[PDB]
Design a protein around this ligand. Structure first.
Ligand SMILES: *[C@@H]1O[C@H](CO)[C@@H](O[C@@H]2O[C@H](CO)[C@@H](O[C@@H]3O[C@H](CO[C@H]4O[C@H](CO)[C@@H](O)[C@H](O)[C@@H]4O)[C@@H](O)[C@H](O[C@H]4O[C@H](CO)[C@@H](O)[C@H](O)[C@@H]4O)[C@@H]3O)[C@H](O)[C@H]2NC(C)=O)[C@H](O)[C@H]1NC(C)=O
Ligand SMILES: CC(C)[C@H](C(=O)N1CCC2(CC1)Oc1ccc(CCC(=O)O)cc1O2)c1ccc(Cl)cc1
Ligand SMILES: CCCCCCCCO[C@@H]1O[C@H](CO)[C@@H](O)[C@H](O)[C@H]1O
Ligand SMILES: CCCCCCCCO[C@@H]1O[C@H](CO)[C@@H](O)[C@H](O)[C@H]1O
Ligand SMILES: CCCCCCCCO[C@@H]1O[C@H](CO)[C@@H](O)[C@H](O)[C@H]1O
Ligand SMILES: CCCCCCCCO[C@@H]1O[C@H](CO)[C@@H](O)[C@H](O)[C@H]1O
Ligand SMILES: CCCCCCCCO[C@@H]1O[C@H](CO)[C@@H](O)[C@H](O)[C@H]1O
Ligand SMILES: *C(=O)CCCCCCCCCCCCCCC
Length: 326
């Protein structure tokens, strides 16, 4: 008797005292104090205030600078848009519901907010995967006579939308479901109840394999091969101080990206390990929901790492912010 079941929701709190209410109808102040809901709002506010400008500005300087509109950069614009889906589909709604202490948009808004917030995070995830694949193809040259062009980059972007719909759409049509999660102010995939009617167990496994294990393998293989190729070529040109510098910075960037991906990936894996083993006990509004709580900041640090640390983007944004000069 861990929580309180109901149609379209699972409140992680026991109703033996009779105080539990539907997360669509009344505040959930038995899960957390009102000030903790306010701090949830403050965190959404921080994410909006940092996440909208960085991601919008990425779209804005691309319009003003012709050099940024290369095919290899299409996937980065895709990343900016996906983060905007997280900011408006997810962070903005949650700021508003947070301050009511419950999900005031009803089960319909739950499917909407859950879809768009999940879509945004999924497009982002597969953008990092596709970018790693593209860089691997361009550097390691695994195809004899291949040249990465505009059409290939469009396939890459379309591929992320297909993968993102593959995760976000089934819960609308019967495989798993969207329900309020954690403090019940935002909606997501249901990893919290085994709903035999929506086959939740098979979807969690599909999510864990296809959208969690595979992305890590692809990112590690592609970037490992790339660093191997770059270090090999530099070894044959040790007379060039610049080639060695380029090799060092490529390696240091790949480390940063992989470390950043792990910082978002490992908390989910640690929670899994605490579900596999330690399966008995319940889990409060801090389920899990802790990996979700911190993965949200990827809408801020991913554009910082993949765009603001890009050599050309930075100069173009300085020029744009500096009213044309500098
Ligand atoms: C967690 O657990 C709590 C406690 O069990 C649940 O809250 C109860 O929910 C039930 C509904 O299933 C509520 O029952 C309904 O109460 C209505 C109001 O009752 C108060 O007001 C009347 C005056 O109208 C007073 O006389 C009375 O003493 C109460 O204080 C009634 O209108 C309802 O009556 C109708 O339905 C019943 C059958 O359920 C019929 O017998 C009646 O004839 C009539 O048709 C009904 O009694 C109950 O009040 C809630 N209790 C509390 C403390 O809130 C939560 O639902 C549960 N949480 C979740 C998420 O499931
Ligand atoms: C982009 C989002 C939509 C996507 C996402 O939301 N999830 C990814 C898969 C996830 C959590 C949900 O991880 C799990 C670990 C263990 C179990 C079984 C144990 C159980 O949770 O019951 C289920 C799991 O589902 C995600 C993917 C990649 C990363 Cl890096 C971050 C998030
Ligand atoms: C830098 C670390 C910040 C930790 C903030 C902890 C704040 C705890 O603050 C306490 O929380 C209680 C919760 O019921 C309130 O009832 C108390 O009034 C409040 O003092
Ligand atoms: C930009 C953010 C806008 C936040 C608007 C929050 C409006 C909260 O609205 C409040 O919700 C309570 C329920 O918890 C009601 O009891 C109050 O009557 C109501 O004022
Ligand atoms: C390094 C990979 C970056 C992608 C980060 C995506 C973070 C998505 O985070 C997910 O968002 C969903 C909707 O808010 C929630 O329902 C999930 O519980 C949460 O883990
Ligand atoms: C996802 C794949 C990430 C690969 C990161 C490889 C980091 C290697 O690190 C490098 O190792 C060399 C020795 O082999 C040292 O000589 C270099 O100084 C060091 O930068
Ligand atoms: C150090 C702080 C850890 C907080 C762990 C998360 C506890 C609440 O869980 C949160 O509920 C919110 C409202 O539904 C969701 O938007 C978040 O994704 C979820 O993390
Ligand atoms: C060129 O690069 C500089 C042009 C003029 C911009 C200088 C002002 C930047 C201030 C940004 C910081 C605002 C912080 C607001 C805190 C809420």
């Amino acid at each position: 008797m861990c929580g309180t079941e109901g149609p379209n929701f699972y409140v992680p709190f026991s109703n033996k005292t009779g105080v539990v209410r539907s997360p669509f109808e009344a505040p959930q102040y038995y899960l957390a104090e009102p000030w903790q809901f306010s701090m949830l709002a403050a965190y959404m506010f921080l994410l909006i205030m940092l996440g909208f400008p960085i991601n919008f500005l990425t779209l804005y300087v691309t319009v003003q600078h012709k050099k940024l509109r290369t095919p290899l950069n299409y996937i980065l614009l895709n990343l900016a848009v996906a983060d905007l889906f997280m900011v408006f589909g997810g962070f903005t709604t949650t700021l508003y519901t947070s301050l009511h202490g419950y999900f005031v948009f009803g089960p319909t808004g739950c499917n909407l907010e859950g879809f768009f917030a999940t879509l945004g995070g999924e497009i982002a995830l597969w953008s990092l995967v596709v970018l790693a694949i593209e860089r691997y193809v361009v550097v390691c040259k695994p195809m004899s006579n291949f040249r990465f062009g505009e059409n290939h980059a469009i396939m890459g972007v379309a591929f992320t939308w297909v993968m993102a719909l593959a995760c976000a759409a089934p819960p609308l049509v019967g495989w798993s479901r969207y329900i309020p999660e954690g403090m019940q102010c935002s909606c997501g995939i249901d990893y919290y109840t085994p709903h035999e009617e929506t086959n939740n167990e098979s979807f969690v496994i599909y999510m864990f394999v296809v959208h969690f294990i595979i992305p890590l393998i692809v990112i590690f293989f592609c970037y490992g091969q790339l660093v191997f190729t770059v270090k090999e070529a530099a070894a044959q040109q040790q007379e060039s101080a610049t080639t060695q510098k380029a090799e060092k910075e490529v390696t240091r960037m790949v480390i940063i990206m992989v470390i950043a991906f792990l910082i978002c990936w490992l908390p989910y894996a640690g929670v899994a390990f605490y579900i596999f083993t330690h399966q008995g006990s319940c889990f409060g509004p801090i389920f899990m929901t802790i990996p979700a709580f911190f993965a949200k900041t990827s809408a801020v640090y991913n554009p910082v790492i993949y765009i603001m640390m890009n050599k050309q983007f930075r100069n173009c944004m300085v020029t744009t912010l500096c009213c044309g000069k500098n």
